[PDB]
Structure formats: structure tokens, C-alpha cells
Write a protein that binds this ligand. Structure first.
Ligand SMILES: Nc1nc2c(ncn2[C@@H]2O[C@H](COP(=O)(O)OP(=O)(O)OP(=O)(O)O)[C@@H](O)[C@H]2O)c(=O)[nH]1
Ligand SMILES: [Mg+2]
Lengths: 182, 88, 488, 208, 100, 69
RNA sequence: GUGAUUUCUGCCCAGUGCUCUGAAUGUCAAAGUGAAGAAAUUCAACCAAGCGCGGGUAAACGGCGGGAGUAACUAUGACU
């Protein structure tokens, strides 16, 4: 009947994992592999621990809300949740921490002088005749326009233009590979 | 968990039931972590004096006035406070 | 979105220690407590300690000689129900509960399609929550089977908007006051035009009211009462369809009509004056009350909840004969009203001067109190079903809760961001729903003066709100031409 | 012309110090602008400095610091170049204010108050040389002046203001030294005020 | 500035001419109360007093704006803006000025 | 100005839980005379004001009897 | 350099700021000598220079929140 129970040495708690740590005195000659009254001791020395743990868990701060069903996040008004503290035991990671700091020689050139990054606002430009907003790259990009022009006004010049673009693309990829090898 | 009547509706009296499994364990061989790996596997990912964040937002700062001892500061010796010029 | 500031470092390092489990230590160092009621009873010197707050109830049952439920409180200082010693000889105050629990109304059922214009008025049947009536911006009203969320029995027969619907306090007929100054009656189960359109007013109908069942001649049916923008107040008997006798006291438009427990109609008008008509005196006003500075909107009585159902209690039963019906209705009215043994029904007024007045028109012609504190016009006011709480809504986004016996101030319910158009109580007088000019509906828990749930789902303004009688459904509707039912 | 220097100094200054007169501070207080700084510029700090503290007893000065320290910090000062009092307390508090704004590349602090309270003398004692002109006549400093110390904190002094209170006297402005007494026309009609303010015992010992 | 002074001076003569119904004598007070409706009497004069401050603030602001103009066009437009806001403040006093 | 779906998108929503939290945390200030403000954390401030009054300001008398009445 | 006299112990019980009769066992890359057990692993001893030890200096470059805790070893003072 009592919802409480006393133990000499105080149990340590990890509410961030829902874990208890008891360090009281056991009896070597109670849990031996053949003692008849073995379960009736295990199940109780653990039940008092669970009692202390539920006592500790049912006294944390609760977090209510006023939302309703459909709420894209989670809980609704009819759910109280316990705000668990953080764990304390140093349990090891599984992969090291992520760090990869290469300057790729562009972050060195641009930083020796004062080239700041760009604002990254939008992807559209304004075509003048025609009167549309014609993505700079992303649909019939302004680049791929000398390709389907109906006359170029000087070997086919449009194919030479394609080749000259491809050369810079491949040079950029090679520069990237070199930087990553450095 | 059942009603208690010794702790109100808040704290109940709990009971356990054994479901499974039920195992014993004896120790065999081990391979322990090297010091370098132990110091490299417990790392917090890294993600302010007199500066506090209040509730409501409100970054605030303390200013910590010193101790001010006016046992110094000899007050100026004006002529009217000198009893030597008393008109009696 | 805007975020609550995150917890600090020292607060995180604090939240890990062991923390504060109560034990209920012994605990009977006995304190002598004074069991005293609210109305007059102080019943008698018992000295218990820390015992079960549900055993105090049984103490009072066995003492007052009934074994009923009782709610408790102490020291009307913060007036809060071992919990009397954890924070700090001591008295005890109690009220009757009349236990009939109403779970909140959280979810949202289907958004029922319907009319082709906005929805102006809505009402729930007094006998079952399975049917419900809505008059809308077209020239029709509609009946909805809430059981299956489906339509039924659209009632064509007007040729202008329907501005008020009422379901008779016996569940026999429905009345639709419209824009064209006709007034029509309809049968629920059939949907046929029960006669022709009553008429006699020169401008539109503002409000309707019915004869309370506990005064109707057994073997007969209740009567009507109709307000109109012209200024007339007309009576109607629903068997002969004849205008019994009119009343023409006011001068401006008249807003609302009531019907008391002793046969006294009350009427507030745009003439800044509340009049008290009479039916035993053929309809000559016996009292005029002029206290407001601007005009008056939505007067409200102390028993206008009991007077609305008429022997159909929260358990959905029915009467078979007017004999048993009249006894049930009298019992209802006495259960709601008899808190001193007399006919102490009060009245509350809501006017465009930001202030409400607390009348007892029987005992005197002076207001008992002047309830004030709003900052814009007060559009709606209501009494609790048990009559000891007044709730008021206003165009300044707030709602205010007053002590309904003398007129004090209790609390404010903030949370709307636009005007509050009207409010509504639940059956057990513990919740309160409200609709607003913005989308959302809000449910408030009166027992703690907080916000329970906030339910969106409409798309434009919301004009009506009606909780059922057994608390099973809440109906709403407005500018988006959809009906909406909310359940638990 | 000077109320256009006041708002300019308040605009440019990160932290303001309001200087008072230890003889009568409540008259030289000039509230009237604290309501402004609170309404329009809450991110500015506004501490008090009570100088000329060697002209009043010690219990008087302590009482005044106490009764003023229930609104703002209010340090207590005495501004001479050789023999001062409070210089360390002001320096090691400007250092705190500078550490708090550790990403602003500098802080500016501005001195405001009535005329002839010692705004320039405080700068002079802090820096330990004659940097701005001082003089017993009220209207000495006329425009604002920047002065650097510690490479990260600037000081700005400005001319002294008198709020245009439409009440409270014509002869109180005289005894809160604002007017150059050479210009008042009949200066003998004000002497009853001197006899009222001072003591007979003190006045008997200076003339004699 | 000149038009600002004009409106302000037309309003001062009204605010200093009428007899200040409060604190004159409880006989004339009550007589004027039954004659001119003390509420409306005070309200119209408070309307005029409020206009007197609004006009002054408009005049004060648009001078400061003009002293940063860079062309005849922009300066002229600021002038017209100021005079128009003044006229629109005044045109709302059609009822109080007719009662008074 | 190019067309875009931002511009016609909400930018600064807030919820009822945050509203109630902040509103309850404006009657627990306890100003310290030695703390100075550094930043103010832009918030919707016209929704968290309005402590309760007891006045109910005067009604407009001009809507019933204008002046010609 | 300063500019008669009189005032001038100034924000520095600041020793990594402008110098060294003085130092140390606080640490200490890599190197080298000792132990376990088959062996990776773990641990003992020796240690170059800077950083804790300290004297000293007055118009004095520029550099700075004070007082405790005396590391429940730190990844350039991660703190309290
Ligand atoms: N007795 C005494 N006199 C002082 C003290 N400090 C300044 N004074 C005198 O007060 C006058 C102050 O002149 P300023 O320092 O220029 O004061 P101010 O008018 O506010 O400063 P400005 O901005 O230049 O106008 C000087 O004549 C000083 O001699 C003080 O601490 N004690
Ligand atoms: Mg001066």
C-alpha cells in the first residue's frame, strides 16, 4: 500500500534516460543460482527502485498546449508531457565530429582582398525583346539561346560556342578535383 | 498501477509482472578502449560574464559599481568654516 | 515563428538534481472548520485534519441528510477550493454541483455544404442534438441531421433573408423571422408550410421569443412574441394565427424581446430605455428604466436557459401528456431559480456606452449595480444556467466574467485578435465557447479562467454559435457558406 | 543653437552621464530629457555623476548618493587635475561598459548637465591635462568636442542646457549658477535670497 | 509659416472669447447648461483646441522638410502638401464652427 | 521587381502558447537598477499590453444629437 | 624633455607590457633508459626551448573589471 519506501544510501537518477542507479548492500547468499526464495527477492529489490523512479518521474514539469488535431507537429490540448532533463553519463559517440576546413585557394584569394559573397537573391533575369523573365539558368537559360538563334552572323559558330562553354565546365571540375586533392 | 489512497490521485502504488526473458551472464574475455579513443569518443559538439538573457528576450548586462569610501576627500577649507574669524 | 527564449546554462545544470516529492506525512493535527453555505446556511463544529476532499462531500451529505455532490472553497483571500497548508482557524464554503459532466469540444466534424449565401442564425433543438436549424442569407432555412452530418428539409417560402430562427420550447414548430416582414412556421418532421405567413409589421423582424411552458394552459400550446425594426412588439397564438394584441411604447427600433417567469416581457430598444410590459394587464407598460447613455443591444434574463427547453432535460427523454410536462417544467424552473425561495430573477443590459446594468425589475426600479470596464460597445451578454455568473462580449477583442449575484468583477478572457461577436455556455456551467470576427472559435474553462482549446477551420467571419443541451455538439457558421459541427 | 548640439551628442554617444551639483542637485537635475532617452533610445545607459563634493559635508554627500541610487548608478566625484576624488571609480566603470560592447570597435560617452557644473573639468581630470577650456563664467563651452582615451573609448563634452520650464522662478536660475551676474540690471534686489539661503554665522566670517 | 500663423490666430480668438462654462457662477453655469447643452458646448471648443495643435504640428514639420529640398519642383510640392493637410484639417470643422 | 511567391507569403506568425507565455511574463518584471539593456527582441507589443482598467471611457454623445438637434 | 614658486602617491600591492646580478623540479615536441603478458595495448624514470618562480624600472610605445576558488588536467585559460 505505501507509495514510498526508505533505503539507506540514496538512489542516483538519470531522468534523461529513465534510469536509476542503486548502490545499497546486497546479500551474496540470497541470489545464488539455487536459492528457492530468489525471484521473490529480485522482483522486490527492483520494485522499490521502480517505486522511487516513478515518484521522481511524476513530479517533473508538465507542458500543455491549446492546439487541436491536425497540428502538424505532435501533441494536442489533451496530452500533458513531462519535460525530461538532460542525461549526465558520458556515453561515447559512434562517429567522430565533423570538421573539414579547406580554403580551396578561392577562399584565400577572395579573402586576401575584400571580395565578399553574393546576396543570392533570385534566379531570373529580364529579357529585352522579348518581354519575359527567362531564367538565367533553369529553363531555356539565356546561355542556351545562341543555340536556337535563327541566324548568328558569324564551321558553325553555334557549335563552337557550345565547345567553348564545355571547356570552361570541364576546367571548373578539374580545378575542384585539384583543390580536393590538396 | 493501482489506486493508493496513501498518496492521492497523483502517486499510485505500482506492481511488476515478469514477462521475459530471464538471463544470467558470466564474464569472458575483454578488449578495452585505448586512452586516445576514449578521449576522442566523448566529445560535446560545441553547440558571457555579466551578460544574461532575460525572459521576454532582453539581453541584459550588469555594471558592478565599486566601493566608495568618502573617508578620503578632505572637504575644502573655506574661510567661513574656520572659527579663527569669529566676531565676538 | 516567434520562439520562447531557451533555457540558460545554469538552469539546465539545475534541472538534474533530485526534486521535491510530497508524501502526505501523517497527517491529522485536527483543525476546527466552519461548514457554511453561500446563500444562508452555516451548519456544526467539526475538527478533522488532512482527509479526502471527496470525504468532505460525504460528510456534508450525511450531515444535511441526503445520502449529492458539493464543490468547496475557503476564505473568500484568493478564494481557492493538506492543500490548504502546503502554501501556508479556517472556514469552508460550498456550492451544489448537480453532477452531469461535459467533456470539452476539441475536434472538428465535416464542414457541411448548404446554402448559397452567408449563414445568419442557427439554433439547436431542445429535445435531441440530432436535428438543428440554420437560417441563411438566401430566402430559406435548412434543417441538418447532425447524427449523420447530412442535410434535410430545406424550407423555401420567403423572398428575403431569414434573420432569426427559433425552435419552440416544446419541439413542435420552428419560426423564421425574415427580412420581408413576414413570419412563418414550419413542421420539423414534414417540412410543409404550416399555413400562411403571419404579418403586420412595417419593417424587418429583429428577434423572437416564446411562452415558457410552465405557464401554458395544459391542453394548449405556447404563444409567440416578435420585435420589429418599426417599433411594434406583437403577440401571436399559433393555433388561430391571429395578432392577439400589439404593444407600441418605444420610439426607435426595438432590439430584443424576452419573457420572464411571472409573465413580464422585457424589451430594450434603440431609444436607450428598457420597458417592462405585462400580459395580465392586456399589454400596458408598467415600468420604464432609463439609465444608459447610448442605445441598447441584447438584453438578457437570469433564467433564459431554463426557459428555453421546457421539461426536456439533459437526458433526452420526452413527455407524453401536458400534465407530467407542466410538473417537469415547474421543477426545472424552481431548480434553476429558487436560491432564496422567491422569484428572484435578475436582468442584465448591454448598451453601446461600454457599460452594463444589473436590474432586478421586480423588487425596484433602480439598478443594483453598474458593471463597467470595457472599452468598446458590448454586443452580447449572457447569464450562467445556474444564474451565478455573467459573461459579456465586446468589440474590443475581450470577454469579461462577472459575479452574477451582485455584479462584481471576476476575470478577463484574452486571446481573440478581432471583435467577439457572441458567446455561449455549456450545460454544466463549466465551459464557454465564443465566436469572433476572425476565423477561430475559442473554448474557455471558467473553473480556472484560462483558455482550454482554440479551434480554427472557418475561412471568413463567424456569426452564430450554439452549444447543444447535452453538450454533445457545437454548431457554428458564417461568411463562408458552410455549416460546421465540432465534437469532443 | 545649443538644443541642436544636445540631440547630436545624444545621437552619437553610446553612454550618457548626467552631471549634478552637490550643493543642490534636485534643481540642477533637468529631468525633462530622461523621459526622452527612455522613450526613443532605450539602448543608451544614462548614469549620474555628482561632483563638487568638496563643498558639502560628508554625511550630506553620502545621503545624496544613497537617495539618488534608487533610480540610477550615481557615482560621486571631485574634479581637480592634481588632487581629485573618484577618477579610478569612473575609469574602471567605463572599462566595464567597453567590455560589454566588445564588437563595436569603440564606445562614445557624452557629458550633459546644467551650465557651470564641471563637465569639462571631469574630462580634464580623467585625462590628466588641460584638454578642454574651463572657466568660472557659465557659457564657456559652446560646441561639442571629441577627446580620445584608451584607444577604444571617446568622450564628448557639449554646452550646458537649461530646460525651458515655464514656471518656478526668475531668481532660481540666478542661484543655480546659469546667468553671468555682470548683466542682471538691479543686482541688489536678489540679496535677501542670499541672506535666506546662507547662514548668518557663516556669512559673518568671510567679510568679516 | 504664414498660413500656419493665420489658422492658429483665427482659432485663438475663439478659444479666448467664449466664457468658460466651468467656474463662472453656478447660476450662469446652469442657465447656459439649459440653454446650449453644456456637453456639446464643451465638445465643440475641445475640437477647435485640438485643431489648433494639429495645424501647428503640421506647420512645424513641413518647414524642417523644406530645408532639405534640392529643386523648385520638390520644394513647391512640399509647400502644396502642407497647405493641403492644413485645409483638410480645417474642412472637418463644418459642424462645430456652425454651432458656435 | 520580378514576380515571386514570397511577397504574398506570411513572414512573422506567432502562436497562442507563445502569446500567453509572453503576456503572463510582463507582470513579473522586478527591475534592477544596475542591469542595462542591450537588445530588445522584437515582439508584437500591441497584443501583450492592456492591463485591466476600471474606467470604461465616456460614450460619444455626438452620434445621437449632432448639433442641429 | 619640461618651464619661477605652491600643488603634483597619477585608472597599475600588472610579476607573460619598455631590462636583466635572480631563476625551475609547473609543464614540457620528438629522442633516448625501465615493467606486464604470446603482442598491439597499458605504465615507471631521464628531457631541449616558451608558459608557472622572481626582482626592477616613473614624461615614460601599447596594453587592461575587480576580488576568491587553487582545475573533479586543458583540446590557446572549453569553467565555477
Ligand atoms: N569647488 C569645486 N569647484 C569645482 C569643481 N569642479 C569644477 N569646479 C569649478 O567649477 C567651474 C567648472 O567649469 P567647467 O569645468 O567648465 O564646468 P562646465 O561649465 O559645466 O563645463 P563646460 O562644458 O566647459 O561649459 C570651474 O570654475 C571650476 O573651478 C570641484 O570639484 N570643486
Ligand atoms: Mg559651462
Amino acid at each position: 500500500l505505501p507509495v514510498t519506501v526508505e533505503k539507506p544510501i540514496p538512489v542516483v537518477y538519470d531522468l534523461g534516460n529513465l534510469a536509476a542507479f542503486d548502490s545499497n548492500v546486497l546479500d551474496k547468499n540470497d541470489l545464488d543460482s539455487s536459492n528457492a526464495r530468489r525471484e521473490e527477492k529480485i522482483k522486490s529489490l527492483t520494485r522499490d527502485n521502480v517505486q522511487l523512479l516513478i515518484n521522481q518521474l511524476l513530479s517533473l514539469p508538465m507542458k500543455t498546449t491549446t492546439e487541436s488535431v491536425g497540428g502538424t507537429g505532435g501533441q494536442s490540448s489533451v496530452m500533458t508531457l513531462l519535460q525530461l532533463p538532460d542525461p549526465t553519463t558520458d556515453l561515447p559517440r559512434e562517429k567522430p565530429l565533423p570538421k573539414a576546413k579547406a580554403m580551396t585557394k578561392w577562399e584565400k584569394f577572395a579573402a586576401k582582398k575584400g571580395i565578399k559573397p553574393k546576396e543570392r537573391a533570385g534566379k531570373m533575369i529580364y529579357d529585352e525583346a522579348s518581354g519575359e523573365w527567362v531564367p538565367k539558368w533553369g529553363y531555356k537559360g539565356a546561355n542556351k539561346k545562341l543555340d536556337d538563334q535563327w541566324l548568328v552572323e558569324v564551321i558553325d559558330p553555334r557549335t563552337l560556342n557550345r565547345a567553348e562553354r564545355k571547356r570552361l565546365v570541364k576546367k571548373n571540375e578539374k580545378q575542384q578535383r585539384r583543390n580536393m586533392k590538396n | 498501477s493501482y489506486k493508493s489512497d496513501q498518496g492521492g490521485k497523483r502517486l499510485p502504488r505500482i506492481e511488476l509482472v515478469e514477462i521475459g526473458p530471464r538471463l544470467d551472464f558470466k564474464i569472458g574475455r575483454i578488449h578495452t578502449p585505448s586512452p586516445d579513443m576514449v578521449t576522442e569518443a566523448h566529445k560535446k559538439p560545441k553547440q558571457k560574464k555579466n551578460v544574461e538573457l532575460d525572459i521576454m528576450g532582453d539581453k541584459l548586462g550588469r555594471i558592478h559599481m565599486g566601493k566608495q569610501d568618502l573617508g578620503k576627500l578632505q572637504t575644502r577649507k573655506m574661510k567661513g568654516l574656520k572659527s579663527k574669524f569669529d566676531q565676538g | 515563428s516567434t520562439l520562447i527564449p531557451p533555457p540558460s546554462k545554469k538552469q539546465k545544470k539545475e534541472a538534474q538534481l533530485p526534486r521535491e516529492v510530497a508524501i502526505i506525512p501523517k497527517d491529522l493535527p485536527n483543525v476546527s472548520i466552519k461548514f457554511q453555505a453561500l446563500d444562508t446556511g452555516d451548519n456544526a463544529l467539526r475538527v478533522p485534519g488532512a482527509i479526502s476532499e471527496k470525504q468532505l462531500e460525504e460528510l456534508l451529505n450525511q450531515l444535511n441528510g441526503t445520502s449529492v455532490p458539493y464543490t468547496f472553497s475557503c476564505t473568500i483571500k484568493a478564494s481557492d477550493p493538506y492543500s490548504s497548508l502546503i502554501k501556508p482557524q479556517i472556514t469552508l464554503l460550498y456550492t451544489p454541483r448537480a453532477v452531469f459532466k461535459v467533456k470539452p469540444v476539441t475536434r472538428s466534424s465535416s464542414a457541411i455544404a448548404g446554402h448559397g449565401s452567408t449563414i445568419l442564425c442557427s439554433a439547436f433543438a431542445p429535445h435531441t442534438s440530432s436535428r438543428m436549424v440554420t437560417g441563411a442569407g438566401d430566402n430559406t432555412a435548412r434543417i441538418w441531421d447532425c447524427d449523420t452530418q447530412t442535410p434535410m428539409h430545406t424550407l423555401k417560402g420567403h423572398y428575403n433573408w431569414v434573420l432569426c430562427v427559433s425552435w419552440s420550447p416544446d419541439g413542435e414548430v420552428i419560426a423564421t423571422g425574415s427580412m420581408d416582414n413576414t413570419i412563418r412556421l414550419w413542421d420539423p418532421k414534414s417540412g410543409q408550410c404550416l399555413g400562411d405567413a403571419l404579418r403586420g409589421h412595417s419593417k424587418w423582424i429583429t428577434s423572437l421569443s416564446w411562452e415558457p411552458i410552465h405557464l401554458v394552459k395544459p391542453g394548449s400550446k405556447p404563444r409567440l412574441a416578435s420585435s420589429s425594426k418599426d417599433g411594434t412588439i406583437k403577440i401571436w397564438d399559433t393555433v388561430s394565427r391571429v395578432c392577439q394584441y400589439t404593444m407600441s411604447g418605444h420610439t426607435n427600433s426595438v432590439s430584443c424581446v424576452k419573457w420572464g417567469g411571472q409573465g413580464l416581457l422585457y424589451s430594450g430598444s434603440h431609444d436607450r430605455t428598457v420597458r417592462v410590459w405585462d400580459i395580465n394587464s392586456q399589454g400596458r407598460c408598467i415600468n420604464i428604466l432609463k439609465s444608459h447613455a447610448h442605445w441598447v443591444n441584447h438584453l438578457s434574463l437570469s433564467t433564459d436557459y431554463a426557459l428555453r427547453i421546457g421539461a426536456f432535460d439533459h437526458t433526452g427523454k420526452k413527455p407524453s401528456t401536458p400534465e407530467e410536462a407542466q410538473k417537469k417544467a415547474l421543477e426545472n424552473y424552481e431548480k434553476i431559480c429558487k436560491k432564496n425561495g422567491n422569484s428572484e430573477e435578475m436582468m442584465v443590459t448591454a448598451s453601446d456606452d461600454y457599460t452594463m446594468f444589473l436590474w432586478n425589475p421586480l423588487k425596484s426600479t433602480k439598478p443594483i449595480a453598474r458593471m463597467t470596464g470595457h472599452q468598446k460597445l458590448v454586443n452580447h451578454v449572457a447569464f450562467s444556467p445556474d444564474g451565478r455568473y455573467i459573461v459579456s462580449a465586446s468589440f474590443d477583442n475581450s470577454i469579461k466574467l462577472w459575479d452574477g449575484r451582485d455584479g462584481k468583477f471576476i476575470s478577463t478572457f484574452r486571446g481573440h485578435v478581432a471583435s467577439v461577436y457572441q458567446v455561449a455556455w455549456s450545460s454544466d456551467c463549466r465551459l464557454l465557447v465564443s465566436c469572433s470576427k476572425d476565423t477561430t472559435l475559442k473554448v474557455w474553462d471558467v473553473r480556472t479562467r484560462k483558455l482550454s482549446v482554440d479551434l480554427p477551420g472557418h475561412k471568413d467571419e463567424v456569426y452564430t454559435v450554439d452549444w447543444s443541451v447535452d453538450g454533445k455538439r457545437v454548431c457554428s457558421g458564417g461568411k463562408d457558406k458552410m455549416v460546421r459541427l465540432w465534437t469532443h | 543653437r545649443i538644443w541642436n548640439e544636445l540631440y547630436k551628442v545624444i545621437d552619437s554617444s553610446d553612454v550618457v552621464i548626467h552631471v549634478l551639483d552637490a550643493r543642490d542637485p534636485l534643481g540642477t537635475r533637468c529631468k525633462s530629457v530622461e523621459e526622452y532617452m527612455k522613450k526613443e533610445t532605450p539602448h543608451k545607459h544614462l548614469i549620474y555623476v555628482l561632483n563638487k563634493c568638496d563643498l558639502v559635508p560628508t554625511w550630506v554627500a553620502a545621503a545624496w548618493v544613497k537617495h539618488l541610487s534608487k533610480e540610477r548608478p550615481t557615482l560621486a566625484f571631485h574634479a581637480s587635475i592634481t588632487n581629485s576624488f573618484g577618477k579610478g571609480s569612473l575609469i574602471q566603470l567605463l572599462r566595464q561598459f567597453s567590455q560589454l560592447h566588445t564588437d563595436r570597435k569603440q564606445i562614445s560617452v557624452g557629458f550633459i548637465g546644467y551650465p557651470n557644473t564641471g563637465k569639462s573639468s571631469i574630462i580634464n581630470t580623467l585625462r590628466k591635462k588641460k584638454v578642454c577650456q574651463v572657466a568660472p563664467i557659465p557659457g564657456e563651452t559652446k560646441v561639442w568636442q571629441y577627446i580620445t582615451l584608451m584607444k577604444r573609448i571617446f568622450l564628448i563634452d557639449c554646452p550646458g542646457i537649461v530646460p525651458p520650464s515655464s514656471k518656478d522662478s526668475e531668481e532660481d536660475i540666478l542661484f543655480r549658477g546659469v546667468v553671468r551676474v555682470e548683466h542682471v540690471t538691479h543686482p541688489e534686489q536678489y540679496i535677501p535670497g542670499v541672506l535666506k539661503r546662507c547662514q548668518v554665522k557663516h556669512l559673518e566670517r568671510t567679510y568679516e | 509659416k504664414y498660413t500656419g500663423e493665420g489658422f492658429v490666430e483665427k482659432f485663438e480668438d475663439i478659444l479666448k472669447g467664449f466664457p468658460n462654462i466651468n467656474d463662472v457662477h453656478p447660476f450662469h453655469r446652469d442657465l447656459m447648461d439649459t440653454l446650449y447643452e453644456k456637453n456639446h458646448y464643451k465638445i465643440s471648443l475641445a475640437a477647435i483646441s485640438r485643431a489648433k495643435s494639429l495645424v501647428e504640428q503640421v506647420a512645424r514639420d513641413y518647414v524642417r522638410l523644406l530645408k532639405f529640398g534640392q529643386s523648385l519642383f520638390q520644394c513647391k510640392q512640399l509647400k502644396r502638401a502642407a497647405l493641403g493637410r492644413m485645409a483638410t484639417i480645417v474642412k472637418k470643422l463644418r459642424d462645430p464652427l456652425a454651432y458656435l | 521587381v520580378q514576380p515571386d511567391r514570397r511577397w504574398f507569403g506570411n513572414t512573422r506568425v506567432i502562436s497562442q502558447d507563445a502569446l500567453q507565455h509572453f503576456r503572463s511574463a510582463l507582470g513579473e518584471t522586478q527591475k534592477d537598477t544596475y542591469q542595462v539593456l542591450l537588445r530588445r527582441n522584437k515582439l508584437p507589443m500591441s497584443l501583450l499590453e492592456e492591463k485591466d482598467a476600471d474606467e470604461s471611457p465616456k460614450a460619444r454623445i455626438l452620434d445621437t444629437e449632432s448639433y442641429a438637434d
